[PDB]
Amino acid sequence: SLYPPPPPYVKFFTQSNLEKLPKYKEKKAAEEITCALDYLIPPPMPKNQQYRAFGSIW
Amino acid sequence: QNPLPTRFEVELEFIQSLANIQYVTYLLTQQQIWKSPNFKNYLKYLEYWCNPPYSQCIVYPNCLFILKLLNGFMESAIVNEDGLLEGLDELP
């Protein structure tokens, strides 16, 4: 199977963790991964705009 | 050689692979990944790519459309007991 499996981060996406997310996001407002919940929050945009797409491939 | 990919890099690579219909198929007709809501929930989380500044990094635009379809389907999709996605049982 040359088809990869989904990213390891999937294990963190339990319904439990989803419930805890809203309060966690709040508390936060008051790579830096410290706990499971951090994975339910999109990673920050890199500075190098070289991640900006050169064009489309449809 | 480059160091191992970042989470941001891993997710950008992964969301974009969904632009390949066969691959999305190979997933849809998996077993294990639909037992638990994890994968389903992951795909909805990935819609973060559909808006700026994220979307401006997408080279394979179809993957966003397919994610959206894939996602809306999953809401009402009925999951068999084994993991089999019910609405697909007739197809290979």
Side-chain angles (χ1 to χ4, degrees), chain A residues 1 3-4 6-7 9-11 13-14 18 33 38-46 51-53 55-58, chain B residues 6-12 14 20 22-23 26 37-39 41-42 45 48 53-54 56-62:
Chain A
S1 47
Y3 279 137
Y9 321 117
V10 180
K11 71 192 218 164
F13 283 72
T14 56
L18 279 164
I33 305 280
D38 283 330
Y39 292 91
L40 312 211
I41 287 156
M45 284 274 336
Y51 286 100
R52 185 153 188 194
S56 289
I57 298 184
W58 4 44
Chain B
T6 286
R7 191 170 147 247
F8 174 100
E9 297 187 300
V10 172
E11 298 197 316
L12 180 65
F14 174 80
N20 172 327
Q22 321 287 324
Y23 176 57
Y26 163 96
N38 299 69
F39 193 59
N41 299 343
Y42 192 60
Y45 151 83
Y48 78 75
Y54 292 105
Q56 294 172 337
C57 300
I58 300 299
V59 170
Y60 296 90
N62 285 354

Side-chain angles (χ1 to χ4, degrees), chain B residues 21-82:
Chain B
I21 304 302
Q22 321 287 324
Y23 176 57
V24 178
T25 288
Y26 163 96
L27 295 177
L28 285 195
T29 76
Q30 280 296 65
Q31 340 78 338
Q32 186 70 1
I33 61 182
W34 312 111
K35 279 178 177 189
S36 46
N38 299 69
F39 193 59
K40 176 189 174 181
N41 299 343
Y42 192 60
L43 297 164
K44 197 188 171 188
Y45 151 83
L46 280 172
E47 278 189 7
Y48 78 75
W49 286 106
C50 300
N51 319 112
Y54 292 105
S55 65
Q56 294 172 337
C57 300
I58 300 299
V59 170
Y60 296 90
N62 285 354
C63 73
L64 296 179
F65 174 70
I66 291 176
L67 181 72
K68 283 288 184 181
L69 274 198
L70 191 49
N71 274 348
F73 170 91
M74 282 303 167
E75 310 190 352
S76 54
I78 307 140
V79 208
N80 180 52
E81 303 131 347
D82 327 323

